[PDB]
Every structure is written in C-alpha cells, then in structure tokens.
Amino acid sequence: VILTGNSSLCPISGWAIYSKDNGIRIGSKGDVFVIREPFISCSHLECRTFFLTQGALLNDKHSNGTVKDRSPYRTLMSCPVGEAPSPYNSRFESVAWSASACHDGMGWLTIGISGPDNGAVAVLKYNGIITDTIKSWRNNILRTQESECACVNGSCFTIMTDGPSNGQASYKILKIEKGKVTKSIELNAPNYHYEECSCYPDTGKVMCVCRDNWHGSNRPWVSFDQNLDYQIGYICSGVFGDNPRPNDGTGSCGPVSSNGANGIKGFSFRYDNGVWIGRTKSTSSRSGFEMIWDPNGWTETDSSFSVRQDIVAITDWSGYSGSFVQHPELTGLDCMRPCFWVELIRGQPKENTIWTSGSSISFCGVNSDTVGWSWPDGAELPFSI
Amino acid sequence: VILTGNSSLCPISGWAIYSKDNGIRIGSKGDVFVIREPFISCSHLECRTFFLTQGALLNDKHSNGTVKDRSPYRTLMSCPVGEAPSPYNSRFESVAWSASACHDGMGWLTIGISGPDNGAVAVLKYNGIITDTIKSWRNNILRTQESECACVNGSCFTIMTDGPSNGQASYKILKIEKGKVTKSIELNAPNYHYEECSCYPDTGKVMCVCRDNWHGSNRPWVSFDQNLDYQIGYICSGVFGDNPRPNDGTGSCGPVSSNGANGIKGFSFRYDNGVWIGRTKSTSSRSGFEMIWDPNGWTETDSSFSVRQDIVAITDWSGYSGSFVQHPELTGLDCMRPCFWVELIRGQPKENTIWTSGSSISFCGVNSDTVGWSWPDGAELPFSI
Amino acid sequence: VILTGNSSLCPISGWAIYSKDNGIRIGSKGDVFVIREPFISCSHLECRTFFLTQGALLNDKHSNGTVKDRSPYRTLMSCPVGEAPSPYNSRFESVAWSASACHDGMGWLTIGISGPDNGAVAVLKYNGIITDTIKSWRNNILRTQESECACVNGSCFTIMTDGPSNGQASYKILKIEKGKVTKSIELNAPNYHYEECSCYPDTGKVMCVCRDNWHGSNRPWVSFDQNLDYQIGYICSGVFGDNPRPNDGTGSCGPVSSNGANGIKGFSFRYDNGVWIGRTKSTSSRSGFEMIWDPNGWTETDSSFSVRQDIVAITDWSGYSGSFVQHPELTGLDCMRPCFWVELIRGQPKENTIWTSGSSISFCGVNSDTVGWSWPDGAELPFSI
Amino acid sequence: VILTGNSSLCPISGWAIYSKDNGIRIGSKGDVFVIREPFISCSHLECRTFFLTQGALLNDKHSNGTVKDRSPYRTLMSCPVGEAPSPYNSRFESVAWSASACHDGMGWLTIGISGPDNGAVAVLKYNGIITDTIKSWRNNILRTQESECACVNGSCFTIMTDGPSNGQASYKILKIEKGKVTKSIELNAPNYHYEECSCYPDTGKVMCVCRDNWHGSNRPWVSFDQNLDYQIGYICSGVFGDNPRPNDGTGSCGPVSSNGANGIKGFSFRYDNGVWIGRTKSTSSRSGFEMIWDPNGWTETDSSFSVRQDIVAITDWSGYSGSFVQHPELTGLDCMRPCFWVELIRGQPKENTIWTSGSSISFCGVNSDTVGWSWPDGAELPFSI
Ligand SMILES: *[C@@H]1O[C@H](CO)[C@@H](O[C@@H]2O[C@H](CO)[C@@H](O[C@H]3O[C@H](CO)[C@@H](O)[C@H](O[C@H]4O[C@H](CO)[C@@H](O)[C@H](O)[C@@H]4O)[C@@H]3O)[C@H](O)[C@H]2NC(C)=O)[C@H](O)[C@H]1NC(C)=O
Ligand SMILES: *[C@@H]1O[C@H](CO)[C@@H](O[C@@H]2O[C@H](CO)[C@@H](O[C@H]3O[C@H](CO)[C@@H](O)[C@H](O[C@H]4O[C@H](CO)[C@@H](O)[C@H](O)[C@@H]4O)[C@@H]3O)[C@H](O)[C@H]2NC(C)=O)[C@H](O)[C@H]1NC(C)=O
Ligand SMILES: *[C@@H]1O[C@H](CO)[C@@H](O)[C@H](O)[C@H]1NC(C)=O
Ligand SMILES: *[C@@H]1O[C@H](CO)[C@@H](O)[C@H](O)[C@H]1NC(C)=O
Ligand SMILES: [Ca+2]
Ligand SMILES: [Ca+2]
Ligand SMILES: [Ca+2]
Ligand SMILES: [Ca+2]
Ligand SMILES: [Ca+2]
Ligand SMILES: [Ca+2]
Ligand SMILES: [Ca+2]
C-alpha cells in the first residue's frame, strides 16, 4: 500500500488527547534517555515517537547539557507512542542532530543530519538502509524539520535550510522516492525565514508551517504540489503564532517584525481561509499551550478568533510542537486526520538541573465533544544528579 | 473473527489459580509502575493486564500518593498477564483516570476518561486510533468500570456514571461498534447506585454487577440485550458482597442500607438463581478474599450458602476485584469461561508509605478439583522511598 | 506439526556447550530474578529456559531465602535460552512451587503445582489456557519433575509423586493430550522412590531417570509406552549417579542403600545396555559436574566406564541437572538429539548470602570433537544485599 | 533466499555514517554489558551487532578486567544495530571467547570458540541449533575473525588460526554449508601471519584482510573461490595499515618488519589495484581512525594516496575495526555495498578503570556526498565502580 495522500483534512471541532508519556517523571527512577523533539509519525499500521538523544540518561553525569546541541553523540531513535524513551524500548534510526521521518505506506524514510557546522550531511535511509545523502550547500548548519515529513502518492517531501538563523538563509523543498532525492527546488523567498517546518499532506499537495527566527512573530508557510510548484506566505492572523511574539493585534501577510527575532518550532492547520493555530500561552516564555480556531486567520489580519481550547496551563512549561497526520489507510476514514504533539521542556535554562529534556503529549482532531485542561510534564525538579 | 458471545457460562466447581504478578515485591528493586486497578481482558489470542498509573515508579519520590486520583498524569497501560508492570514491558493505551477495555475478536476497544471533574471526556480508541468521544452529561466526574467491557456479536458494552458518589447519580449503558457509540440508554434507577461495574457476556446478553457507594451493602446489577433492553436489581443473598457491609443476615432484593455507604469494586457471576460471590473476608477492612457459592443467592434473601473457597487470608490486604471471561474463540470450549482478578493493595491509607499500589492475582472457573489457599501480595513495607 | 517422537537417540561421542546465562554475575547490577531449576525445553521452532522464582530480585530484601520453598509467591516463568532471567525478558507461565513444561509440536503444555502441602493442585495449561487440574491424592506435597515433560505423537507425559520424601511414596505416570489428562497409572513400586524425574522420548516411548530420596544412591528409572505399559528399575552401574553417594564400587539393579538418603535432581541417557551419566564430581557436596559414558552401565554392576568429560570443576558449585531433547522437527536430523542443563547454585546454605539462586549452563550431544573444561557460575559473593 | 554473492563492490566516493550506539555513555546509568568486538552482520532483512561479553555489566565489580580474556564466562550475544548492548535487548548466541557470524539468506551461522587454550573447540550453530564442531589442531588457542564470515551462493567462509601469536602459526580456510564444515584447506604461508581476518564477498569469491601479529606492519590478505582455491599476499601500499606501524614510506608486497610485532584487528577493501584502508590515526597508540583511498595501493609500494576521510580524531580512542557488507537481497542495489564498524575502546590499559569495554560506530560506502568528522565514544571516565 502506498499512501495516496489525496484526501482533505477531516472536519473537526476540537482536540481529543491521544498520548502522554510521562518520560521525565518515569526517568526519575527508571533508565530514560535525555531527549528533545519527540515528534510523532505514523505508518498505515502504527504510530511511533521519534526523538533526538545525546546518548545519555536522566539522573546521570552524561546528561550535562553543556554539550553542544550539534554533537557527534546525538542520535535519532524511536519508540512506541506513549512509552518513556528508554534504551530498552527504543529503536536506533540514524546519527543526527537534526532530523525528520515519515512512512510512505511501504517503508520508513528517516533523515538524519550530522557532521560539522561548515559541511553537515543529511543521511537518508529507507527501511533502515542508506539510500542517499545531501550535503550542506551554504556551509552553515544544514538543518531540517524536527517533525514528520509528508508523503503523497509514493513520494515524501521535506524542507531543509542552510544559512544564518538571524538573517536571510536558503530554503529547499526536497522530493524523495524510496529514500532517493528525485527533485529539489530552492525557494525564492527574499525577506522570509524558514526553520523547523511542520508539514502535512492535504488533497494531493503538502502544506508546511514553519518558524521565522529572523524577523517574524507570525509563522511563514510554504505549500507545493508533487512537481514542487510552490506558494509562500505568512499566516495573516493577528493571533500571532510564534514565541516570542507581541500581544494579539493587527497581523500581516508578510513577516511581523515586532518580537520577530528568535522563535519556537510550531505548526498550524489551514482550513479554507481559516486556521487552527497551536501556540504557547505566554508571549515571552515557553509556557502553556492552546489551540485557537480563527475562521478567517489564514488570509485576514484581524485578531478575532472563535474558539480557544486549553492544552497546558500558562503556569507550566511547554516547548516545541508539530503536526502529524493519520492517513485513511491507517484510520479507515475518508479524510486526512490532523493531530499534533507538544514537547514539555524541563531543566535548563529555566530550571536548576544540569540537563534539559522534554516529555510529550499529543492530541488528534475530532468532530465530537472535547474539553480543555492542562496536561503538563509533572516532574519534580531537580533529581539527584 | 468476531466473538459471538452466544455461549452460556461454563459449569464450574471452583477456581484454579491463573496468574500472580508479584509486582510490588519485584518493584522493591526493579523499575515497576505504581499502579491501581490491574484488570485483565482477553482477545481470541491472548490475555493482558490493563492498569492505571500515575506515571511514576515504586521507590521514587513521584510515587508520593498525595497526587490527586484524577490527575493529568494518569494513564491506562497494559502488559502481559503475570508480569510486573514496568515501563520496559508495558504498552501505552490512553490518557485516563478511569477506564475500560475489551476485544471484539477483531480489535481492542479502550476507553479512557480524563479532563476536569466538571467536564471529563471519555476517549474511545479501536486498534489504538481515536474513534469517538463521550463528554460528561452531569458535570460531576464521568467514570466507568475499571475492568473489562463485554463484547457480543461485534458490539461491546459498558456502563458509565456521572453524578454524586454519595447520593443519586445518573447511569448509562453504551453500545459501541468498532469504537463508535451506536446506542445508549439511561437507567431509570431511582434509589439505585451504580459504580465500577463488572460486566460479562452470557448467552447473547450482558450482566453487570456493580458497587453501590450510596446506601447498599449488597451489590446492584444490570443486565441487557444487544438492543439495550435492560433489567435492574440487587443481589438478594444475605451473604453480603460489598465492603464495608454488615455481618451476614437477611438480604434484600433492593439496597441494604446497613453499612451501605462507601464500598469496593467487586463482581459476582449468576448461575440460574444461584450466585458465585467474590468478597473480602473482613466486613470493615479491605482484607482477605473468598469465593462463595450460594445456590439460591441471586433471588433469595437467606444467608445460607454451600461452598466457600479461600483466596486471600483475612490477615492480608486485598482490594478491587473484577470479572473477565475467556470466550470459546480463545479456549476452544463450547461455553463462556468465567475468571476473576483481585488487586492486592499496599501502602496508604493502611500502611506507612508515601505511595499506594496494588499487585494482582487471578483465577479461572473450572469443573475439576481445586483448593483454597492464601496468595497475598508478599511485599515487606516500607521501601526506601 | 505434532512431534512424532519416533526417532531414536542420535549417536554421540561427547557434549558441545550450548548455552551459559551468567545470570548471577549479571544480577549483581541488573534486575534479575532469584531463581531455581532453570530447565530448558524446546518446540519445533525455539528453545526456552523455564524457571521458578519467588517473585523477588537479586540484591533485594525480598530475596531473603528464609521464605518457604512452597510459597504462594513462587511462579513458573520462562525466558529465551542464554539470557539472564529478568522481569523485562521473562514470560509468566503459572503460579507454582513445582513444575514441568513441554511442547507437542502445536503448543506449550505447562504444569504448575501450588496450594497447601495437604492438598496441592497442579494446574495444567495448553497455550496459556487452563485445561485441567490434578489434586493431591495422598495429601503430602504433590510434586513433579522440575524439568521438561516428554511428548510423543500428540501426547505428553510426566511423573508426579505424592507422599513422604524419606520413605515409601506414591508415583503416577500421566498422559496428557492438549493439556487434558487422558490416562494415568500408579507405579507398583514397593521399595522404590521417584522424585524429580528427567524424562525424554526415544523410539516412540519415554524414559525417565529420577531421584531416590529415601534409600538409593543410584538412580531409579521408569520407561513406558503411549498406553502407559511401564517398566521400572535402577541404573545398575557402580558409577553411582546421585549426590550424596558412596565411592564407585559394586552397583545394584535395585536401590543402593549406602548414602542413599537425600539426593539431587539429575538425569542419564540409555543407549542399548550402556548409559551416559551426568553427575556431580563430589560424592558428598553439590560440587563439580561431569559426563560419564559407561558402555554396560544400564544393566551391569561393575564400576568400570570408558569416557569422562569434565563440565564443572570440583572446586565450583553445581546443582540440579536435567535432560532436554531437540526433535527432528526442530533440528532437521533423523534422530532425537540429547542435551542437558546444569543449575549452578549459589548462596545458602554453602555461602554467606541471604538468598539462594542458580545460573545455568547447557550442552548438546554431538558425534564430532568436543572438550572437557569448567564453566562455573563465576559470581563473586556476597553482593550488597 | 540464498544470497548469491555474485555482485561486485559498489562504486563509492566516501563513507556515510550508519550507526552509533553510545553504549558506554548509556552504561554510566543503565544496565549495559561490558563488551568487546562489536561486529555488525546483516541478513536479507536486518542488521545486528554481535559482541563478546564477560557476562558482567558496566559499573559493577564483575567488570573487573583482570578476568582472563579467554574465560568460561565469555559469550557471544547480539542486539539490534545502534542500541546499547543490555541484558534486556540482547539475544544469546554461543559460549565464546572468539567468534564469527554471518547469514546465508536462509539462516544465521554463528561460530563460538570456548574451552582450554590447549584444546579449544569451535561450536557452529545454524538457526541456533548446533551443527558442527571444530577442535584445535595445534593445541595453541584456536581463534577466528571477530567479525562477520562471508557468504556466497549458500556456503559461508571463515579463517581460523591455531599456533603462536608471535611467530609462525597455522591458518585454515573453512567452507560451511548450513552450519556444517564441508571443506577446509590449510594455507601454505611460511613467513605470513594471519589473525582476526575481515572477510567479505566480491564477485563470487571472498577477500580477507587480516592482522599480522608476528612481523608485519602492513596487512596480510587471502582471497579464495568457492572451491577454496586461494591466493595470498600483503597489501603493497606504503600507507601502512596496522597499529603499531612505521611512518608512511616504501611498502612491500610481503610483511613489513618495521614495527611489525603486535597489531590491531582491521580491514581494507580492494578495488582493482586500489585500496580503501581504514586505520588508526596514531602509529603507536589505538587512537583516531581514518579512511584512505590509495588508487594503486593494493599492488604498488609508494606512500602516495588521494583521499583521506576522518572518522575519529587522533585525540580520541579507537580500537578494532572490521568489514561488513550489505547484499543486493537486502538493499535492492545491483552491487555489493561495503561498510565498516569501529570499536571505540575505553578503560584499561590506557585509562584508570577496573574494566575495559568498547562502544561502536559504523559507516557505509556511498557514491554521493560525505564528510569527515570525529564521532568518538564520549563517555567521561572513571565510573562509580
Ligand atoms: C508528599 O506530598 C505532600 C503534599 O504535598 C508533602 O507534604 C507537604 O509538604 C510541604 C513541604 O513543602 C508542606 O508545605 C507547608 O508546610 C507548612 C504548613 O503546615 C508551612 O509552614 C510551609 O511554609 C513554609 O515553607 C514554604 C516552602 O515550601 C514557604 O513557601 C513558606 O513561606 C514557609 O517558609 C509549607 O507551605 C505541606 O504542608 C505538606 N502538605 C500536607 C498536605 O501535609 C510531603 O512532603 C510529600 N512527601 C514526601 C516524602 O516528599
Ligand atoms: C580486580 O582483580 C584483581 C586481581 O584479582 C584484584 O587485585 C588483587 O587483590 C587481592 C586482594 O584479595 C590481592 O591479594 C593478595 O595481596 C597480597 C599480595 O600482593 C597478599 O598480601 C594478600 O595476602 C593476604 O590476604 C589474603 C586474603 O585475600 C590472605 O589469604 C593471606 O593470607 C594474606 O592475609 C593477597 O593474597 C592481589 O595481590 C591482587 N592481585 C593483583 C594481581 O594485583 C583487585 O582487587 C580487583 N579490583 C577490584 C576493584 O575489586
Ligand atoms: C558540565 O560541563 C561543563 C563544561 O564541561 C562543566 O563546566 C561543568 O562543571 C559540568 N557540570 C557537572 C555537574 O558535571
Ligand atoms: C530473613 O528472614 C528471617 C525470617 O523472617 C529473619 O529472621 C531474618 O532477619 C531476615 N534477614 C534479613 C537480612 O532480612
Ligand atoms: Ca520569530
Ligand atoms: Ca480572525
Ligand atoms: Ca456500599
Ligand atoms: Ca442462600
Ligand atoms: Ca536500575
Ligand atoms: Ca538418594
Ligand atoms: Ca561398566
């Protein structure tokens, strides 16, 4: 079965909780990896949590977070959804300090980038076998989504960036077939900035909503078809999606400069001219999380919206978030089901531990009754080491 | 295979021991979850122990019981029968502080309720994919069986309660097909109280034996067909089934008010006008466990009975108990085999630890020789943390 | 595939090492069960180590060996051959303080005996489902092989004893089909004593070599066909097989009274009128292990033998041992392959620890070059707890 | 599927990183074996890391290295590629202090040598069942590759050595079919020394590149067809491959005596008259690792080469290395893909711990962009015990 990716997003009214791994609470006693970016992705049969570890465990000296983000120890691993990430239940995927993965209906594509800042190489694997490599073309931290790539009709698609994180960089869409890059195109996107894209399939095409780290407090997006014919823009809503950001106000269909530098990985789902935005509750801190339905927020610049669903209270830490979908081949539905995950970051810099790790929660969009609450990390810091 | 559920309960003379997990003894050293309600449910292929954890391990500070029962950390997980519940051998099922699960012959249905007390939502999954949600209709702690739902002819059935635990509440039967609620009905049950139902299939219908927490020291029951045409009553026997309860005496076919407030999850099996009652040995404490065959105990109020089989000595702690069955599709038999599990609760409030957990034992009904004994938890408390 | 069991034992010249689990060395740090009787048994696809645990781990207070042997905590579990027995890699089989198991080509038969000394019940399971029970018929510690039962042509066979361990008892052969006892017969064996039988299939029949705990320092045997037509005797060799025993000398075809009380589980393989005897090296202590080929030792009473192969040095602890076979269905050979396991007992009474546990080694008989050595337990006692 | 082994080595330009297990970093906290020789071998379906352990974990007294290398505790185990080797994720293979393994397309062959120095025996298993044994013919430490054997057209091939490690010894090629030795031949190799061969299939034949521990600082090789018709030589390049070795200079097609005694397990791949050499960066210490393409280095003695790719910095410890391939049956390619693993040795004798262990990295040859870097072990020594 190759996933067709021809269905449109399911009608939904809210988000039902799908998983919670309690990774950090468990790792207080058990043998649990220090991780970041616990992104979920699914096949036609099952869903997995992928994550990066520095190959060190919680409550151990090697968790010391003074290690560079881009270290030769960092690996992409995966485990079943909702389980603490341990060396006893986790599969090895790739050596990587930046990553993506996705399933085409027949096999897993994993992308793991390692190597030096001035010449990083993405290693592509299909079913665990190396199938291609892509080397840095600007010699400045080649990097990718940190969430699932999107697959449509036997090809999978991702976005890579190379260049400054605080100025204009270079952005490419990649089309990958059975692990081999068969087409790419560079975005002609002066004055845009794309990092950490959350990309999903929709009606035979792909939509990516990303992080502008340079000068936008709204999120950039890029959409494209199977030929890589693309469109670009920013989400117009004055309900700003990045962190940090200003208070809600008048939005822009280009980058909103106020509080624009820096950011956080996030996602949104487009429905017609409306948008579901996932975002932190705080405008300044990685605290809280909420889903907002703004029925004209993709294309209109007002700050009005119609629904807010609480996910994590502003008094609790949140973190990266990303989209994942469940295809009809998996669910039996006739539409593409949107879901998202949230990383709940504990430790440095906000808290007095030697380490930084995340646990995770995830939700799927449903057209049935839901409720807002807070499902935070719950660990009591610090630990013993 | 869909399980037909048309067979009648097997003839039995007693109970043979099926499993014992020694979870707490093992958790003295190993990495074992703090758990409650270790209920068993089976498919046509295998049996699993489902349970709720606070996402915390024994011998760790996060096991501190002062965590509310209905926390955002609580999850429904499952592991193979008879194994200590560890993060290294347990599958994640649902985020949940009250739960049920059962298999229809084709896939697992799990029901996990989380959210706030005033608006809890049951997330239903079939084969791990969200298929439906049910929101609180009385805004007062929507809650369910804490043991296996019952499946007959491709539909599965459960009971949910919403409302006070110390007065009249609202009780609904749900009919669920491939994880979708296809029918429900509210019980017209003034003066009844239903919590924590133990429900099993028998001859194409379902029988549930429950807990009256309001004003009954005998157990309420509800039985229904596939259309949800129901009957209700209380077990008539003067061999009282709840805990606490009075000394055995004259029963009632309605709620027995003496020592009626409070209670414990339990079960019973009806055979004609007779009943197999599982109950604690103490009338005041959650201590001991025994099976009693009262050949007229379903419909008659005398305190006479004919067989007692010891399961746990009165000098050892017991706890919740529930029914599970093994269908002909699993066993090759021509009848529905009754089994039960018992939770052996250690820690608070009866013991001086920061935590409360249970281990489990289980037994199956056989028409061959058996013996009474005591198979208690066996852990020596307190632990280190 | 049902195993035919019609082949005769393979011609062999010696024993090649098959496994070593290093369980106790590993359990110095890892989470490893305290176990006894690590017996191996195989299907047509794989081999497993079965074992009894008190549901406690090494380096923990619950390993305190003052617990009765026959406790309600004892369980029969299994794990893959050669792996340390941990709660993370072990399957639960049965609640049991005496056990046997074997595979008929279609499913696993497990037999676990629990309950009180005066009324123990063996629970039989086939594919994990209870299929029969057998209750004590002399009310005096019903007990069985502690090694694999033997299967021939769709039936499996075992020996149970009930009665004194220091005088005449009662011995029965059981024939079991898909987990159900279909025939049994009591041995007419005045002045014999049978415990802890090691039974293997050979040419459509079964041979058991056992432990006389009453008054024999040679080993009793019983052989029988599928109808339970049986023969009994003792191994005639003056190379005495039990522990304790006298120095080698003139044997007897009945029980050898010198040093006859007490014993150890062991095994031997009959070839024509000759015998391979596995035995401790010490006549008085459970120390060392060796395989002896005595070409007339089944029926002749001299103390001459022709081959000795060292297995464990006399300076290292040994313990229980038993036979297992690999059938043609597994191996592809045209003969029945004999193997054996040895339990290497550490701790009490010989050593200053609170616990007693065994690790294991195993060997298979080959007709190719082999070597004698010592493969002892290797743990450094005591541990920390 | 039997692997044909008829394809030729893939064209490559460099090495892409395939795995890194961080075993020692993880073992600082988790339950991880002390291991050596973590060699990779693949089937038509998956790849595994095989290794030898002393049956002891990191951070435990049993890791005390003073245990002889050739102990009765040493076992060959395997785990998935890239996972820390733990008792909870590792399969038992053989009792062994020297080993090989490889898959023929239908099943795993493992070879494990144990026993005394004067009479060691190789136990061969196919699909885990003993199929043959080979006893020492010179009575002086029978020993084998410590990396994967090579399979071609349903036969698998290995090299064993028996005799001195510091003078002339005896070297045999074995041809093994379904775990049975069907042919062997002794190398007529006066003045050669072969240990620890790294052997791979190429165009229906096998090439082995080995370690001369007697008097060669270049590497000996032996190649042979399916009939065991062989050729022998040494790698001619003045880019010397062993450790220790002299500075690069004029090579020889026979053993280079300068710094020739001692050595390290390593590998090289022949392409026409050229060679990819993997070697330590230091000439005196087991430090660093690099791949060197010398386009005439198989047959010509100059010290010129054309490509160097860094793998481990000279400031970090390396260790043994070996070849493994991925056959077309696994990859879908039309050529035989070369890969290699490196063992990163920590502890004694270079570091102040009681133990010695390695972690691993591995790379596969690709004809696409790659990059040099350093991917060292990363553990901070000493540990607690
Ligand atoms: C398991 O959970 C239990 C419930 O949370 C814990 O019990 C609680 O422990 C805390 C200690 O932090 C205690 O807090 C208050 O104790 C005093 C009230 O009786 C009060 O004087 C304290 O106030 C002082 O200290 C705090 C610092 O935390 C300052 O903010 C104040 O300014 C002041 O200096 C404090 O508020 C709780 O009373 C107690 N709760 C209950 C319900 O008993 C257990 O400690 C925990 N067990 C384990 C083993 O960890
Ligand atoms: C890892 O293994 C190493 C090798 O086994 C250990 O080193 C050995 O430690 C032992 C201590 O038991 C030591 O034993 C002898 O030490 C003296 C010789 O130099 C000698 O005086 C001792 O004799 C005395 O003590 C013994 C009791 O054991 C009595 O029998 C005697 O009567 C006398 O009172 C003793 O024989 C070894 O010398 C030493 N071996 C070597 C080769 O250096 C390490 O201890 C171990 N490391 C860890 C961390 O455990
Ligand atoms: C962590 O690493 C940094 C940099 O190497 C060092 O300065 C610091 O002391 C370390 N902290 C701990 C707790 O080991
Ligand atoms: C073990 O148990 C016995 C009997 O209960 C007791 O006497 C002894 O003190 C215990 N030992 C330890 C170390 O706990
Ligand atoms: Ca920004
Ligand atoms: Ca709007
Ligand atoms: Ca009550
Ligand atoms: Ca009655
Ligand atoms: Ca531990
Ligand atoms: Ca005896
Ligand atoms: Ca003789």
Ligand SMILES: [Ca+2]
């Ligand atoms: Ca050398």
Ligand SMILES: [Ca+2]
């Ligand atoms: Ca050259």
